[PDB]
DNA sequence: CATCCGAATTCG
DNA sequence: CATCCGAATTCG
């Protein structure tokens, strides 16, 4: 009666120490052994690495132009049924919504990920993309459990500007009472991969789910351990979440 | 019967061709002979020049640190009564509100000018300053006619963001039906003093007046400072605004 | 003695 | 092969 998953922007666009960082991401995958992994900022060579070092995950992608998202499904645990790609017609960064329908146990899921439009200056487009995601979450068949997990790039004000989440969609971190230990998934004071001398902190990485049949049990940051090469696996922390279906 | 005035950011911060440009500004003052002139971005030497080349105007200033505003009063037409400076506590650019009470044509006026906080990213402070100005315009007794004219640096929606003009305060341009001939007072297409390649057009320079019972009615609004000087540059990067109003 | 537009870029 | 924060600066 459970699903566990990681969502993680793994910064494929950072060319520094990629082999070692991919190894570290694959270490987290082996150690935490989630059913599903949502990845953003993947690049082709990174896929090839996951194919050898996380071989028990099926990699589902849509378009692979430049950098992209992927959903990884644990073989034997998760059965793929179908995929759907929802475009963001006004994106300037090749962003979109990747949806995968799966079965895990006797439970049907619609798993979605995206990397929403980046940077402060593209707030209006990022908000339009969010609304597109939220609308698609609501369209899913009543019997299916919908989970979105991704790099939303959202900051102060924006979700409110959007009019807030609909009454049957919830943010897992909010649902769990806004625990302080995972309140930031991108934090330049704690993570120095970008060498930014300022301390800025954001909750860019978020999980939304439609529902009280679905109950988040835990949420934790992963990728917190600096690698021997002196770099974190990514500039983002990953999020590990377990949900119970009641 | 009337009042005429010019408001003009004369770009004292542009150090090139200042003497010819000052000569150009003084030419406009002689030719249009306004009762009052509201100037922004004045610098000390520029004041010195006006005292010689527009010597029939009394120059009224508040603080003179760096660059500043001034209000010029035509000697014999306008009688100075008093001045008041209202500070903008959160300014990072030494901006403030300069108010001068005067008598003109047997009528009493409170004339105000300011150079509101500059640049796009200082919208919040600029809006707070606008509120301060608009609030100050309501304080004078109804008998006194209140006129604000200055470089407001305002752009799209900022006035709405502020709650809009109160019901007894009007923008002279809007009042006159938004005439296209003087819409933009800062225009990089038509004015090349900053040599900006792009075409940006703004209405930074604005005139607000308090009416109530229609005792003050704008008659005309025109751009001044449109004539290129011998050096192939204009007096300022802004056009000035010449306005005439009837006291009814 | 300088600033000013604003999209792109730099740099802390 | 790159991006990414955000204030400050560059340059069209
Ligand atoms: Mg990145
Ligand atoms: Mg200037
Ligand atoms: Mg600037
Ligand atoms: Mg940037």
Of the candidates B225, B231, B171, the residue with the CA atom closest to the CA atom of residue B203: B171
Note the maximum CA span of chain B.
Answer: 49
Q: What is the CATH number of the domain that holds A159?
A: 3.60.10.10
* CA A244, chain centre distance (Å): 18
Pairing mode, strands A57-61 and A68-74 = antiparallel
Pairing mode, strands A2-9 and A36-42 = parallel
- Contact status, residue B99 vs residue B80, Cβ threshold 8 Å: no
Cross-strand partners of A243 = A3, A216
- Active-site hit among A14, A35, A151, A220: A151
* Tokens standing for residue A98: 């990747």
**CB of A195 nearer than 7 A to strand D:** no
* Tokens standing for residue A21: 């960082």
Distance, CA of A61 to CA of A69 (rounded, Å): 7
Distance, CA of B75 to CA of B158 (rounded, Å): 37
Distance, CA of B206 to CA of B187 (rounded, Å): 15
Q: Count how many domains chain B has.
A: 1
A151 is catalytic: yes
Of the candidates B17, B23, B113, B116, the residue with the CA atom closest to the CA atom of residue B59: B113
- Contact status, residue A171 vs residue A135, Cβ threshold 8 Å: no
Residues 6+ apart with CB under 8 A from B218: B172, B175, B176, B209, B243, B244, B245, B246
Cross-strand partners of A97 = A86, A114
**Structure solved via:** X-ray
**CB of B94 nearer than 7 A to strand C:** no
* Tokens standing for residue A64: 């692979």
DSSP B234: -
CA of B121 vs C1' of C6, distance in Å? Answer: 11
**CB of A224 nearer than 7 A to strand D:** no
Residues 6+ apart with CB under 8 A from A160: none
Classify burial at B16, counting beta carbons within 10 Å of its beta carbon; exposed 0-12, middle 13-18, buried 19 or more.
exposed
Distance, CA of B37 to CA of B100 (rounded, Å): 12
Distance, CA of B102 to CA of A39 (rounded, Å): 70
Q: Structure resolution in Å?
A: 1.9
What count of other Cβ atoms lies within 10 Å of the Cβ of residue A85?
12
- CA distances for A90 relative to A94, A152, A163, B106, angstroms: 9, 16, 21, 62
For A13, the domain range is 1-246
Residue found under tokens 């990072």 = B92
């Amino acid at each position: 009666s459970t699903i566990s998953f990681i969502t993680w922007n793994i910064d494929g666009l950072d060319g520094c120490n990629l082999p070692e960082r991919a190894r570290g991401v694959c270490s987290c995958l082996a150690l935490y052994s989630p059913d599903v992994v949502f990845l953003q900022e993947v690049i082709p060579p990174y896929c090839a690495y996951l194919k050898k070092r996380a071989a028990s995950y099926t990699i589902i992608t849509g378009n692979e132009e430049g950098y992209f998202t992927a959903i990884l499904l644990k073989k034997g645990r998760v059965k793929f049924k179908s995929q759907e790609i929802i475009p963001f017609p006004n994106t300037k960064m090749m962003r979109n919504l990747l949806c995968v329908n799966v079965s895990l146990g006797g439970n049907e899921f619609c798993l979605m990920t995206s990397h929403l439009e980046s940077t402060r200056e593209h707030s209006a487009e990022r908000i339009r993309q969010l609304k597109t995601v939220l609308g698609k979450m609501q369209e899913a068949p009543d019997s299916t459990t919908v989970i979105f997990a991704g790099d939303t790039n959202l900051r102060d004000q924006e979700v409110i500007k959007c009019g807030g989440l609909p009454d049957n969609v919830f943010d897992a971190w909010e649902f769990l009472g806004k625990p302080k230990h995972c309140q930031y998934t991108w934090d330049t004071k704690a993570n120095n991969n970008l060498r930014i001398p300022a301390a800025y902190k954001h909750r860019f990485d978020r999980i939304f789910f439609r529902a009280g049949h679905l109950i988040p049990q835990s949420l934790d940051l992963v990728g917190l351990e600096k690698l021997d090469c002196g770099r974190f696996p990514s500039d983002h922390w990953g999020l590990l979440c377990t949900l119970n279906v009641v």
